[PDB]
Scaffold this motif. Structure first.
Motif, PDB file in Angstrom:
ATOM      1  N   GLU C 312       5.032   8.593  -1.543  1.00 17.51           N
ATOM      2  CA  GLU C 312       6.130   7.510  -0.840  1.00 17.51           C
ATOM      3  C   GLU C 312       7.212   8.395  -0.235  1.00 17.51           C
ATOM      4  OE1 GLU C 312       7.011   4.638  -3.878  1.00 17.51           O
ATOM      5  OE2 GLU C 312       5.228   5.574  -5.264  1.00 17.51           O
ATOM      6  N   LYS C 313       7.914   9.580  -0.868  1.00 16.03           N
ATOM      7  CA  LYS C 313       8.952  10.205  -0.201  1.00 16.03           C
ATOM      8  C   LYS C 313       8.503  10.676   1.361  1.00 16.03           C
ATOM      9  CE  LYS C 313      10.944  12.091  -4.441  1.00 16.03           C
ATOM     10  NZ  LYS C 313      11.458  13.362  -4.990  1.00 16.03           N
ATOM     11  N   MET C 314       7.200  11.054   1.610  1.00 10.48           N
ATOM     12  CA  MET C 314       6.752  11.728   2.640  1.00 10.48           C
ATOM     13  C   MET C 314       6.500  10.617   3.532  1.00 10.48           C
ATOM     14  SD  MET C 314       4.097  14.612   1.114  1.00 10.48           S
ATOM     15  CE  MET C 314       2.985  14.091   2.581  1.00 10.48           C
ATOM     16  N   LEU C 315       5.953   9.582   3.367  1.00 11.98           N
ATOM     17  CA  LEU C 315       5.738   8.473   4.434  1.00 11.98           C
ATOM     18  C   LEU C 315       7.191   7.738   4.813  1.00 11.98           C
ATOM     19  CD1 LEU C 315       2.715   6.665   2.644  1.00 11.98           C
ATOM     20  CD2 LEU C 315       2.903   7.677   4.981  1.00 11.98           C
ATOM     21  N   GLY C 316       8.196   7.606   3.854  1.00 14.34           N
ATOM     22  CA  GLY C 316       9.506   7.146   4.192  1.00 14.34           C
ATOM     23  C   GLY C 316       9.923   7.982   5.163  1.00 14.34           C
ATOM     24  N   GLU C 317       9.960   9.489   5.045  1.00 16.54           N
ATOM     25  CA  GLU C 317      10.358  10.482   6.142  1.00 16.54           C
ATOM     26  C   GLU C 317       9.645  10.322   7.244  1.00 16.54           C
ATOM     27  OE1 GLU C 317      11.464  14.998   6.501  1.00 16.54           O
ATOM     28  OE2 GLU C 317      10.496  14.387   4.895  1.00 16.54           O
ATOM     29  N   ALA C 318       8.203  10.372   7.394  1.00 20.26           N
ATOM     30  CA  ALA C 318       7.617  10.534   8.544  1.00 20.26           C
ATOM     31  C   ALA C 318       7.616   9.029   9.372  1.00 20.26           C
ATOM     32  CB  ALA C 318       6.252  10.642   8.418  1.00 20.26           C
ATOM     33  N   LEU C 319       7.611   7.794   8.708  1.00 21.05           N
ATOM     34  CA  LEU C 319       7.830   6.625   9.496  1.00 21.05           C
ATOM     35  C   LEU C 319       9.170   6.407   9.880  1.00 21.05           C
ATOM     36  CD1 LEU C 319       5.759   4.867   6.982  1.00 21.05           C
ATOM     37  CD2 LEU C 319       4.865   5.406   9.106  1.00 21.05           C
ATOM     38  N   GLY C 320      10.139   7.286   9.182  1.00 27.03           N
ATOM     39  CA  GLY C 320      11.676   7.075   9.958  1.00 27.03           C
ATOM     40  C   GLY C 320      12.266   5.783   9.294  1.00 27.03           C
ATOM     41  N   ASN C 321      11.840   5.041   8.322  1.00 27.55           N
ATOM     42  CA  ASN C 321      12.373   4.124   7.728  1.00 27.55           C
ATOM     43  C   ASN C 321      11.662   3.762   6.567  1.00 27.55           C
ATOM     44  OD1 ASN C 321      13.449   1.580   6.932  1.00 27.55           O
ATOM     45  ND2 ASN C 321      12.790   0.378   8.706  1.00 27.55           N
ATOM     46  N   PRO C 322      12.305   3.703   5.327  1.00 30.92           N
ATOM     47  CA  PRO C 322      11.754   3.578   3.832  1.00 30.92           C
ATOM     48  C   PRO C 322      11.140   2.125   3.818  1.00 30.92           C
ATOM     49  CG  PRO C 322      13.899   3.609   3.560  1.00 30.92           C
ATOM     50  CD  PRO C 322      13.853   4.022   5.120  1.00 30.92           C
ATOM     51  N   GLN C 323      11.423   1.006   4.804  1.00 35.83           N
ATOM     52  CA  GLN C 323      10.861  -0.146   4.632  1.00 35.83           C
ATOM     53  C   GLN C 323       9.488  -0.298   5.200  1.00 35.83           C
ATOM     54  OE1 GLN C 323      12.810  -1.680   2.770  1.00 35.83           O
ATOM     55  NE2 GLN C 323      14.704  -2.569   3.490  1.00 35.83           N
ATOM     56  N   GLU C 324       9.043   0.950   6.129  1.00 31.23           N
ATOM     57  CA  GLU C 324       7.718   0.688   6.619  1.00 31.23           C
ATOM     58  C   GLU C 324       6.673   1.229   5.793  1.00 31.23           C
ATOM     59  OE1 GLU C 324       7.426   1.733  10.712  1.00 31.23           O
ATOM     60  OE2 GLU C 324       9.393   1.661  10.841  1.00 31.23           O
ATOM     61  N   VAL C 325       6.991   1.752   4.603  1.00 35.08           N
ATOM     62  CA  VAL C 325       6.219   2.413   3.747  1.00 35.08           C
ATOM     63  C   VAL C 325       5.028   1.511   2.844  1.00 35.08           C
ATOM     64  CG1 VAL C 325       6.091   3.504   1.320  1.00 35.08           C
ATOM     65  CG2 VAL C 325       7.693   4.176   2.943  1.00 35.08           C
ATOM     66  N   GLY C 326       5.616   0.220   2.668  1.00 40.67           N
ATOM     67  CA  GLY C 326       4.743  -0.766   1.965  1.00 40.67           C
ATOM     68  C   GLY C 326       3.618  -1.156   3.031  1.00 40.67           C
ATOM     69  N   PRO C 327       4.178  -1.910   4.209  1.00 37.56           N
ATOM     70  CA  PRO C 327       3.141  -2.092   5.021  1.00 37.56           C
ATOM     71  C   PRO C 327       2.105  -0.980   5.607  1.00 37.56           C
ATOM     72  CG  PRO C 327       5.545  -2.868   5.733  1.00 37.56           C
ATOM     73  CD  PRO C 327       5.517  -2.062   4.763  1.00 37.56           C
ATOM     74  N   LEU C 328       2.568   0.065   5.650  1.00 35.51           N
ATOM     75  CA  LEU C 328       1.548   1.231   6.056  1.00 35.51           C
ATOM     76  C   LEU C 328       0.518   1.376   4.907  1.00 35.51           C
ATOM     77  CD1 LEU C 328       1.454   4.003   8.210  1.00 35.51           C
ATOM     78  CD2 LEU C 328       1.009   4.683   5.844  1.00 35.51           C
ATOM     79  N   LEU C 329       1.144   1.332   3.717  1.00 37.43           N
ATOM     80  CA  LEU C 329       0.156   1.367   2.634  1.00 37.43           C
ATOM     81  C   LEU C 329      -0.743   0.290   2.379  1.00 37.43           C
ATOM     82  CD1 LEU C 329       2.577   3.038  -0.214  1.00 37.43           C
ATOM     83  CD2 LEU C 329       0.623   4.086   0.765  1.00 37.43           C
ATOM     84  N   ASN C 330      -0.450  -0.873   2.740  1.00 34.77           N
ATOM     85  CA  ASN C 330      -1.180  -2.087   2.601  1.00 34.77           C
ATOM     86  C   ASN C 330      -2.246  -1.811   3.866  1.00 34.77           C
ATOM     87  OD1 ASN C 330      -0.419  -4.005   0.495  1.00 34.77           O
ATOM     88  ND2 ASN C 330       1.323  -3.662   1.390  1.00 34.77           N
ATOM     89  N   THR C 331      -1.848  -1.674   4.992  1.00 40.72           N
ATOM     90  CA  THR C 331      -2.589  -1.265   6.127  1.00 40.72           C
ATOM     91  C   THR C 331      -3.991  -0.446   5.774  1.00 40.72           C
ATOM     92  OG1 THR C 331      -1.170  -2.169   7.843  1.00 40.72           O
ATOM     93  CG2 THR C 331      -3.065  -0.578   8.320  1.00 40.72           C
ATOM     94  N   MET C 332      -3.574   0.786   4.903  1.00 41.33           N
ATOM     95  CA  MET C 332      -4.529   1.507   4.627  1.00 41.33           C
ATOM     96  C   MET C 332      -5.434   1.063   3.531  1.00 41.33           C
ATOM     97  SD  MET C 332      -2.335   5.241   3.988  1.00 41.33           S
ATOM     98  CE  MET C 332      -3.670   6.220   3.889  1.00 41.33           C
ATOM     99  N   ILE C 333      -5.034   0.245   2.786  1.00 38.19           N
ATOM    100  CA  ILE C 333      -5.769   0.174   1.698  1.00 38.19           C
ATOM    101  C   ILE C 333      -6.780  -1.250   1.874  1.00 38.19           C
ATOM    102  CG2 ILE C 333      -5.873  -0.976  -0.854  1.00 38.19           C
ATOM    103  CD1 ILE C 333      -2.967   1.503   0.103  1.00 38.19           C
ATOM    104  N   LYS C 334      -6.217  -2.387   2.422  1.00 38.69           N
ATOM    105  CA  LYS C 334      -6.808  -3.500   2.599  1.00 38.69           C
ATOM    106  C   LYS C 334      -7.982  -3.306   3.099  1.00 38.69           C
ATOM    107  CE  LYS C 334      -4.271  -6.988   4.281  1.00 38.69           C
ATOM    108  NZ  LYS C 334      -3.077  -7.225   5.198  1.00 38.69           N
ATOM    109  N   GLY C 335      -9.115  -4.084   2.605  1.00 40.71           N
ATOM    110  CA  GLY C 335     -10.562  -4.116   2.897  1.00 40.71           C
ATOM    111  C   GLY C 335     -11.253  -2.649   3.228  1.00 40.71           C
ATOM    112  N   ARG C 336     -10.440  -1.502   2.512  1.00 44.42           N
ATOM    113  CA  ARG C 336     -10.952  -0.258   2.843  1.00 44.42           C
ATOM    114  C   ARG C 336     -11.185   0.342   1.650  1.00 44.42           C
ATOM    115  NH1 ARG C 336      -7.902   3.584   5.533  1.00 44.42           N
ATOM    116  NH2 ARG C 336      -9.779   4.548   6.113  1.00 44.42           N
TER     117      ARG C 336
END
Ligand SMILES: CCC[C@@H](CC(=O)C(=O)O)C(=O)O
Ligand SMILES: CCC[C@@H](CC(=O)C(=O)O)C(=O)O
Ligand SMILES: [Zn+2]
Ligand SMILES: [Zn+2]
Lengths: 18, 338, 338, 18
Positions: C312-336
């Motif tokens: 969670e910390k690394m994604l918040g840093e890499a995405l530049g905005n901690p609010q983008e962490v959830g959407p990216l995690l959901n994109t990774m998992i849904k249907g996968r």
């Protein structure tokens, strides 16, 4: 550093490695 | 649709017709077909968008290639020939099958000499068998003299300038592709830039941009079918893959002499036209440009895809078992981010 | 339950009774209460499991502490005093509020002198007000002479040996905790080892092991309430938090002279007994031992928690905005992966 | 290296930093 680690692209394509 | 079938010179009529295309659930719009001298073509390539270039002469010396010429000249090296009892030639990585022992591939790889591929093709056509073959082999040093001369005669001037102008890395390989009519390569993306040079017959190419990741459901990174879509385009399961109802494609049919730029990370579904005879293609795979020195926010879709792949790889390594990746990801999100 | 209320020496009767405990939805079993000389106590600490030690004398010189003694001797430094109109004193990090501007805390921090805390407490008790205070202040150099002598008189011999034997890092702080009867600290885990030394009054401690992460739904790492449970223990929302129906606690009531080992990553819910008067505690927070040189598989629950936090910390840093962490995690998992 | 990066514990506790 962490950001560039996570952004690093691979180079995999649809061709079987031996 | 793809755009009206092109009328061939000398009044030879439509090269192909729409009855030769398979039927799918999603809409498409056409990929532009442009001269390589058209500034719009350079604009598309620079922006990593697909374009069909009609006049590059990239593989001009290969346009005379057929099975008889190739058999006589391509030498006595081994060629990878996939066999399947379905039209779909879904790619899988043999090296990942250990991770997923319940994965039963529907295609099998056989190494053979080129004349054995030609003979097997003729056996099948003679008995009216349903077996399908797809030869997929990187070009290498074993090819005979005339193929070397043909290869040297590709338009290296044009494509070397593309590589240089786009900042790409090295040409890693050229895949020779010889397919039977009706063969399908299911939707996947590759992590290299691709100039796809059509030589014989016609292939329908359906592309989807990297921001449709959410609609195309790639397999887990550690699965043998990493980078391929899980969706069966012939029977889409909308309960498991609901956002496939939102996919929109970019479509074209390439024929001899056409070159399709398939940008890195773009999904692509490729089919050899029904009743169109054998197809021959040679691709040109280049490593992408490096990550830029300064990162601009918000990130592009392909950057988020790169991040997601790396998260899956790192978790597989850190957890010691790629099967623990899904359970950990679900534990992270459920009731927290979903 | 916690175990039968202990009978106080001199026939002074039960220290407390079950009517002083709040009612919750989950079952519990008791944390062992043992002598520090009991080999089972050492076994629990070594295995990072909770134990109540009854006879450490860890804060023996503090057992005489009350508001009058502390006011006279603790000096004129500032003390953090939280105020709330609810019994729940949910921790939040003020420095993360920028990330979540829709988060409206139910408790507020006020800096005051100790005599001002005592006066405010008396004002509230006099008017029968409903306001609640919780003083939570790390001990520092400003404390007066007698508090220094009391502190020097803690059982450093015993706890220094614990630190050494367990491989822990430094003592980072001692938090002085003075609460009103009925005050609750909602369930959370800390990333340090804790010897929790009860001084005055009684606190019910409910612990949950790190493998109940899935049942306790911590806030996102970038939320001000990082490491705290999202579940309202007084009104659990089983539609959002279905696995809270599976939580099972380890329970005890500590009183003066007791020391509870709260192992790093263990969830804990702490309440000052209803109608039990003010409570005083001093904790001892130590950095955990380093990651071991060789990793053993499969990983422990606390190791997977550490991984999830870092993702969670690394994604918040890499995405530049901690609010983008959830959407990216959901994109990774849904249907996968789900 | 990546494994030890992901396994690294923090040290955060319920006490407000100034
Ligand atoms: C093994 C890929 C075959 C595809 C082409 C492709 O995806 C590509 O060149 O990346 C096809 O059937 O022509
Ligand atoms: C600010 C923490 C207060 C808690 C103790 C606790 O969680 C801990 O020491 O880690 C309580 O109300 O006593
Ligand atoms: Zn491809
Ligand atoms: Zn705590």
């Amino acid at each position: 550093e962490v950001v560039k680690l996570l952004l690093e692209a691979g180079a995999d394509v649809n061709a079987q490695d031996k | 649709g793809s755009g009206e079938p092109r009328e061939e010179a000398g009044a030879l009529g439509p090269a192909w017709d729409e009855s030769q295309l398979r039927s799918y659930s999603f809409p498409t719009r056409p990929i532009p077909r442009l001269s390589q001298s058209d500034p719009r073509a350079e604009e598309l390539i620079e922006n990593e968008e697909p374009v069909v270039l009609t006049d590059t002469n990239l593989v001009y010396p290969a346009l005379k290639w057929d099975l008889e010429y190739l058999q006589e000249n391509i030498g006595n090296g081994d060629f990878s020939v996939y066999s399947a009892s379905t039209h779909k030639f879904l790619y899988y990585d043999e090296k990942k099958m250990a991770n997923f022992q319940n994965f039963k591939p529907r295609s099998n790889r056989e190494e053979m000499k080129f004349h054995e591929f030609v003979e097997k093709l003729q056996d099948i056509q003679q008995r009216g068998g349903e077996e399908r073959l797809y030869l997929q082999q990187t070009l290498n040093d074993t090819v005979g003299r005339k193929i070397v001369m043909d290869f040297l005669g590709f338009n290296w001037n044009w494509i070397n300038k593309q590589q240089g102008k786009r900042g790409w890395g090295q040409l890693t390989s050229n895949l020779l592709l010889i397919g039977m009519e009706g063969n399908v390569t299911p939707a996947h993306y590759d992590e290299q830039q691709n100039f796809f040079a059509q030589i014989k017959g016609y292939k329908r190419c359906i592309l989807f941009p990297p921001d449709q990741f959410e609609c195309l459901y790639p397999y887990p990174v550690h699965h043998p079918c990493d980078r391929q879509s899980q969706v069966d385009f012939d029977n889409p399961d909308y309960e498991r893959f609901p956002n496939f109802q939102n996919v929109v494609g970019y479509e074209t049919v390439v024929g001899p002499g056409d070159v399709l730029y398939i940008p890195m990370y773009w999904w692509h579904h490729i089919e050899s036209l029904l009743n169109g005879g054998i197809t021959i293609t040679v691709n040109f795979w280049y490593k992408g440009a490096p990550t830029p020195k300064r990162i601009e926010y918000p990130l592009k879709a392909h950057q988020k895809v790169a991040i997601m792949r790396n998260i899956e790889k790192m978790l597989g390594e850190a957890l010691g078992n790629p099967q623990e990746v899904g359970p950990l990801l679900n534990t992270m999100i459920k009731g927290r981010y979903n």
